[PDB]
């Protein structure tokens, strides 16, 4: 018709990337740095726990969300670069992070549910092409720009599992 | 050729040091920002301007723009390296080396500003600066990021006031 079986997963991933914008605007005003390794380690440990809860491979989930979070931090740093050149262009008085936190919790759960439901595909030779189809379709539907296209690539780079070498 | 070409070329050269500075910070997991240091850096420059009877408020404004643009580049490189960490340079000159390169560039810049004071404070400055930017963008083959950074770095040049 024709939709990728991975479209829902990729669409969630891209929507979760888009939380980079309110988070960066908030951090910019609050004079907070983008990165925090201790924080990310905590987020990833909780995601591993959520994986075990739905009998999903936690090491796999850790790798995938490690990619996702780096890709999100990459968007935040690009904004900081822009706002450093033209500070007038930074969103003024932005709201706190509660909506963002709620959106991330929901999207995390959406992503895990899709990992569970498409585990066979993610383990199969057809994964690579079906991921490329899903990416094409979501870049179109969400109208993602150059920066978000690179970020979506980075976010999804560990989705397709390695196959037997013989 | 624009009379501000050497000044703009120096500024562009100094912007290029953002790469090894960022690379070093990436490896050592040091923060890009350093408000304490920046405000100190500008103090040294303001003093050098004063000893040479060059308008210190002007010089401080210019280097503040320059430093802002350098930070913007460091942020953009961190974005790139988060997307693709394999592309981050593995050695990086010591921060000490890069900072010494910057210090020499500061001196060269301040010397060029004093030398071209008559043009910087003249109505033709905007025209000559746009000309110098076009030329250096060409000669150094500056990408979209460095073009924007050079604009930011040089945005206060033509604010110079003529003497006496």
Curated annotation (Swiss-Prot), chain A:
Changing residue 16 to A: Less than 1% of the wild-type enzyme activity. Tyrosine, phenylalanine, and tryptophan moderately enhance chorismate mutase activity at low concentrations, but allosterically inhibit the enzyme at higher concentrations. GO terms for cellular component: extracellular region. Disulfide bonds join 127-160. Changing residue 76 to Q: 40% of the wild-type enzyme activity at pH 7.5 and 27% of the wild-type enzyme activity at pH 4. Homodimer. Catalyzes the Claisen rearrangement of chorismate to prephenate. May play some role in the pathogenicity. This is Secreted chorismate mutase. It comes from Mycobacterium tuberculosis (strain ATCC 25618 / H37Rv). The lineage of its organism: Bacteria, Bacillati, Actinomycetota, Actinomycetes, Mycobacteriales. The chain holds residues 34 to 199 of 199 of the full protein.
